[PDB]
Amino acid sequence: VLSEGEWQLVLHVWAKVEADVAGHGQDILIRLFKSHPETLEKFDRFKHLKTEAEMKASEDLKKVGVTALTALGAILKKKGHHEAELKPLAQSHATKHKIPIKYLEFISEAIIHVLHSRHPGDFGADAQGAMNKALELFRKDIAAKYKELGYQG
Numbered sequence: 511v512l513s514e515g516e517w518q519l520v521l522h523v524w525a526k527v528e529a530d531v532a533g534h535g536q537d538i539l540i541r542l543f544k545s546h547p548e549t550l551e552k553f554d555r556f557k558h559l560k561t562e563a564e565m566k567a568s569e570d571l572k573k574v575g576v577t578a579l580t581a582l583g584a585i586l587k588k589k590g591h592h593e594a595e596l597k598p599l600a601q602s603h604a605t606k607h608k609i610p611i612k613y614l615e616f617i618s619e620a621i622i623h624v625l626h627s628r629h630p631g632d633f634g635a636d637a638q639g640a641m642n643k644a645l646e647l648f649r650k651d652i653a654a655k656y657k658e659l660g661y662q663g
């Protein structure tokens with residue numbers, strides 16, 4: 511789907527993320543909740559976290575962010591060959607915790623924002639475009655897996 515060069519840009523910036531997955535995850539979740547406050551309602555264990563510092567101090571929130579970025583990293587490393595990784599992720603999102611595709615767009619925006627804020631020299635326009643294509647592919651294929659399970663996303 512993406513060119514080999516586009517995948518290399520995605521995986522180059524992802525290696526920078528892996529220097530501090532927890533901190534990237536916290537900043538991504540905080541940015542998501544600030545930009546799109548409806549998304550915080552999907553996390554009932556976080557409703558008492560009122561400030562950014564409270565969110566950064568919550569080991570629970572940090573672990574949730576690492577779980578999500580670890581799954582995304584493994585998917586991105588498959589360079590589009592990711593059916594076996596998306597099926598269980600679609601199930602985790604489409605049953606009891608219905609996560610709309612729009613919310614995956616919102617977190618994709620937060621991912622782009624945080625990667626650029628932390629790694630501008632490794633995440634210029636071509637790298638941003640490549641990451642956007644990779645996340646668009648992720649969301650398109652998740653949406654198809656949602657539908658197979660009976661969830662229209």
Ligand code: HEM
Nearest residue numbers: 549550552553574577578579581582602607609613614617
């Ligand atoms: C890059 C995007 C995302 C990835 C890769 C991701 C990944 C994951 C993974 C791996 C799990 C663990 C499932 C399990 O262990 O069975 C999970 C659970 C969950 N995700 Fe996501 N997630 C993403 C985005 C979101 C968003 C945007 C929301 C809500 C706005 C969300 C809400 C949840 C909830 C509610 C759960 C289960 C309960 C919990 O962890 O508190 N996820 N996600």
